[PDB]
Design an enzyme around this catalytic site. Structure first.
Site, PDB file in Angstrom:
ATOM      1  N   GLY A  86      42.394  47.670  49.307  1.00 29.09           N
ATOM      2  CA  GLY A  86      43.233  46.507  49.502  1.00 29.09           C
ATOM      3  C   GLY A  86      43.036  45.513  48.379  1.00 29.09           C
ATOM      4  O   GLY A  86      42.285  45.743  47.432  1.00 29.09           O
ATOM      5  N   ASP A 135      31.730  30.960  55.020  1.00 29.89           N
ATOM      6  CA  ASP A 135      32.998  31.649  55.219  1.00 29.89           C
ATOM      7  C   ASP A 135      32.891  32.619  56.382  1.00 29.89           C
ATOM      8  O   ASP A 135      33.453  33.716  56.353  1.00 29.89           O
ATOM      9  CB  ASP A 135      33.447  32.366  53.945  1.00 29.89           C
TER      10      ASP A 135
HETATM   11  C1  LIG Z   1      34.157  44.165  49.022  1.00 24.62           C
HETATM   12  C2  LIG Z   1      33.177  44.773  50.023  1.00 24.62           C
HETATM   13  C3  LIG Z   1      33.781  45.852  50.923  1.00 24.62           C
HETATM   14  C4  LIG Z   1      33.089  46.924  51.474  1.00 24.62           C
HETATM   15  N1  LIG Z   1      33.933  47.640  52.196  1.00 24.62           N
HETATM   16  N2  LIG Z   1      35.196  47.035  52.127  1.00 24.62           N
HETATM   17  C5  LIG Z   1      36.364  47.415  52.698  1.00 24.62           C
HETATM   18  N3  LIG Z   1      36.375  48.602  53.531  1.00 24.62           N
HETATM   19  C6  LIG Z   1      37.556  49.024  54.255  1.00 24.62           C
HETATM   20  C7  LIG Z   1      37.851  48.143  55.473  1.00 24.62           C
HETATM   21  C8  LIG Z   1      37.061  47.044  55.794  1.00 24.62           C
HETATM   22  C9  LIG Z   1      37.393  46.292  56.907  1.00 24.62           C
HETATM   23  C10 LIG Z   1      38.493  46.658  57.668  1.00 24.62           C
HETATM   24  N4  LIG Z   1      39.219  47.713  57.335  1.00 24.62           N
HETATM   25  O1  LIG Z   1      40.326  48.063  58.126  1.00 24.62           O
HETATM   26  C11 LIG Z   1      38.934  48.449  56.280  1.00 24.62           C
HETATM   27  C12 LIG Z   1      37.511  46.648  52.491  1.00 24.62           C
HETATM   28  C13 LIG Z   1      37.405  45.509  51.681  1.00 24.62           C
HETATM   29  N5  LIG Z   1      38.553  44.655  51.405  1.00 24.62           N
HETATM   30  C14 LIG Z   1      39.923  45.264  51.128  1.00 24.62           C
HETATM   31  C15 LIG Z   1      40.742  45.500  52.389  1.00 24.62           C
HETATM   32  C16 LIG Z   1      40.785  44.384  53.311  1.00 24.62           C
HETATM   33  C17 LIG Z   1      39.500  43.744  53.525  1.00 24.62           C
HETATM   34  C18 LIG Z   1      38.829  43.397  52.208  1.00 24.62           C
HETATM   35  C19 LIG Z   1      37.556  42.625  52.469  1.00 24.62           C
HETATM   36  C20 LIG Z   1      36.941  42.046  51.191  1.00 24.62           C
HETATM   37  O2  LIG Z   1      35.548  42.052  51.339  1.00 24.62           O
HETATM   38  N6  LIG Z   1      36.224  45.212  51.154  1.00 24.62           N
HETATM   39  C21 LIG Z   1      35.128  45.976  51.383  1.00 24.62           C
END
Ligand SMILES: CCc1cnn2c(NCc3ccc[n+](O)c3)cc(N3CCCC[C@H]3CCO)nc12
Lengths: 279, 65, 286
Positions: free
Chosen positions: C10, C113
């Protein structure tokens, strides 16, 4: 916190011999890279050390007259960045004039000292054209500086430990009538300690305590009981002896410190500018 | 499997820091500047600054590389 | 480099996250200050309930940050109407959140946050505080902050009244809001503005007075509100036990000094009472 920090884990070295090894290794690797790429144009490691000391004083001077007033923590962070960078890199490859400004820039960012880039470079005593050129150089070298710090940006300085020791003395050491009388001179010693390699060799708390006790010794006050009783080192005399040895070693580092000479530095600056112009 | 609180055990390599809720009783707070009414309203107390300063002073004092 | 891009996880307001080989990479002013904040703080922290910065690299004015890959977050759990949130699940989430917060506050860092989507969950059920782009160290008098921190729904009243100096109370109030959202499955105090946020807080919890918050009126953006009696907690949270209600009351105390810390919350009877927290392997998967 320092006790589980990157500074303690990766940037506090066992001896001056290790630091000399790192600096000589950096000089030799730059020599090998330059020889492969392409004479006596090279600076010796002690000449590199002299230039690094001179440019650290220049970094201190830049941070002192920096407007808006740069906090002492930012200045300490910048100087630490400078030392750490030139542990593993040669002034012949990266000019300390630009690296020192980049260290101030990165430290201002890391320590949350909010300054705009134009107002950062407005502190330079150079022309506006030179200011834009310097800003572009700083932006070019910011990522390089972060990489060479291994992305270890938090720097623990002796200032807050110094304040904490003053609080603890005022609270638990009535023998010392007014501990604030020790501030100025200890601050003086702190500055001197900063010029040496102590920040790479001792903990911030040890540096602060050494400064305070040297100030007391100059004042003639004995605070052996503070170490023995208030810090409760009488229960582990080996701990007290190790602490006293650490402070004695730091005092020795300060006393042996050789400030760079103007003429030697001028010759070295011509040499370094020659090395940068060539290649 | 009931939960039981256990305190965090991080070695500081230095002298013991007095508890946050005891500094005033021990007279430390006499040597820090008092938190302003706005500071207290926001939740900042001078005891926080004193505790941080003492923790930094004692952190790694006995540590050797 | 040594990470092959697998999937586009994302985009965020500051960077874009890609799942790689399994990790997540978050790819004239120079390096972005938010990325630098995350770097400088996560390099100094190591705890099971804090997101781990595994590696960092960049080029020119851009930088990438490598984190452990997280399966989901608490927001997906809460909004998943097909998932039942038993008291044990709620206790487990609250426990991990508070343990991470206790470690963070011990190292004198405020998250600032806290919200369900910033509480990520890995495939093992370990909750981790993430998104340290707003986190800042606290405890220095000479280090003022801004009140416009924390998402509005989870923002503490001291922040809404303009507190430039504050402590762990901001995170703990956000934690109380997360607990309330866990219990109600909807945002507890869904304001549309700062004034409406304070209005919802006072209408639900009562208008604070001098005995509950002695210096309240000294906050710069302090506005007097209608004296709402509030709604008793057992009316709002009907299924909450007495211990859980005591925890909620502690988290929502108006005076941030009286508001319970992470340590104090962890010592509360709610956490040591039956039933025990759900093991991570048994926590619901959305
Ligand atoms: C940056 C650290 C991290 C570790 N895993 N992860 C993920 N995992 C997939 C996920 C997480 C939660 C809910 N869903 O449905 C999928 C997503 C994401 N980012 C992009 C997508 C929306 C959240 C956004 C958050 C920003 O930290 N960032 C991270």
């Amino acid at each position: 916190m320092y006790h589980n920090s990157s500074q303690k884990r990766h940037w506090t070295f066992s001896s001056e011999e290790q630091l000399a090894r790192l600096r000589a290794d950096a000089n030799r690797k730059f020599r090998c890279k330059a020889v492969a790429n392409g004479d006596p144009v090279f600076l010796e490691p002690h000449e590199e050390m002299t230039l690094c000391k001179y440019y650290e004083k220049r970094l201190l001077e830049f941070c002192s007259v920096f407007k808006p007033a740069m906090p002492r923590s930012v200045v300490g962070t910048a100087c630490m960045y400078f030392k750490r960078f030139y542990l593993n890199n040669s002034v012949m490859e990266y000019h300390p004039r630009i690296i020192m400004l980049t260290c101030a820039f990165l430290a201002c960012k890391v320590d949350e000292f909010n300054v705009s880039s134009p107002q950062f470079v407005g502190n330079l005593r150079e022309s506006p054209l030179g200011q834009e050129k310097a800003l572009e150089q700083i932006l070019e070298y910011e990522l390089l500086l972060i990489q060479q710090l291994n992305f270890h940006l938090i720097v623990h300085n002796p200032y807050r430990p110094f304040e904490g020791f003053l609080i603890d003395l005022k609270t638990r050491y009535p023998i010392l009538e007014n501990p604030e009388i020790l501030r100025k001179t200890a601050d003086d010693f702190l500055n001197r300690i900063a010029l040496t390699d102590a920040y790479l060799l001792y903990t911030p708390s040890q540096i602060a305590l050494t400064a305070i006790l040297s100030s007391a010794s100059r004042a003639g006050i004995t605070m052996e009981s503070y170490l023995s009783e208030s810090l409760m080192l009488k229960e582990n005399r080996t701990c007290l002896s190790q602490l006293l040895d650490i402070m004695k070693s730091m005092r020795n580092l300060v006393k042996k410190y050789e400030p760079p000479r103007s003429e030697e530095v001028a010759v070295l600056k011509q040499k370094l500018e020659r090395c940068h112009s060539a290649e | 499997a009931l939960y039981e609180y256990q305190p965090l055990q991080i070695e500081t390599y230095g002298p013991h820091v007095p508890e946050l809720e005891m500094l005033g009783r021990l007279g430390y707070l006499n040597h820090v500047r008092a938190a302003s009414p706005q500071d207290l309203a926001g939740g900042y107390t001078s005891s926080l600054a004193c505790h941080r300063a003492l923790q930094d002073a004692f952190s790694g004092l006995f540590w050797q590389p | 480099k040594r990470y092959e891009k697998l999937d586009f996880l994302g985009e965020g307001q500051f960077a874009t996250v890609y799942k790689a080989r399994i990790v997540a990479i978050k790819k004239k002013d120079g390096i972005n200050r938010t990325a630098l904040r995350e770097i400088k703080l996560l390099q100094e922290l190591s705890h099971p309930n804090i997101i781990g910065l595994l590696d960092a690299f960049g080029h020119k004015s851009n930088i990438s940050l490598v984190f452990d890959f997280m399966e989901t977050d608490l927001e997906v759990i809460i909004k998943d109407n097909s998932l039942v949130l038993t008291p044990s699940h709620i206790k487990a989430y609250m426990l991990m959140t508070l343990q991470g917060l206790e470690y963070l506050h011990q190292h004198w860092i405020l998250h600032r946050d806290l919200k369900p989507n910033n509480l990520l969950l890995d495939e093992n059920g370990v909750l981790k505080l993430a998104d340290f782009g707003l986190a800042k160290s606290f405890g220095s008098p000479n280090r003022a902050y801004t009140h416009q921190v924390v998402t509005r729904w989870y923002r503490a009243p001291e922040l809404l009244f303009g507190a430039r100096m504050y402590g762990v109370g901001v995170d703990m109030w956000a934690v109380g809001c997360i607990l309330a959202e866990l219990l109600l499955r909807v945002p507890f105090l869904p304001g549309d503005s700062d004034l409406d946020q304070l209005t919802r807080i006072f209408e639900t919890l009562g208008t604070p007075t001098e005995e509950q918050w002695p210096d309240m009126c000294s906050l710069p953006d302090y506005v007097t509100f209608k004296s709402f009696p509030g709604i008793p907690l057992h009316h709002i949270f009907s299924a909450a036990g007495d211990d859980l209600l005591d925890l909620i009351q502690g988290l929502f105390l108006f005076n941030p000094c009286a508001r319970i810390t992470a340590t104090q919350a962890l010592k509360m009877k709610y956490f040591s009472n039956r039933p025990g927290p759900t093991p991570g392997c048994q926590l619901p998967r959305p």
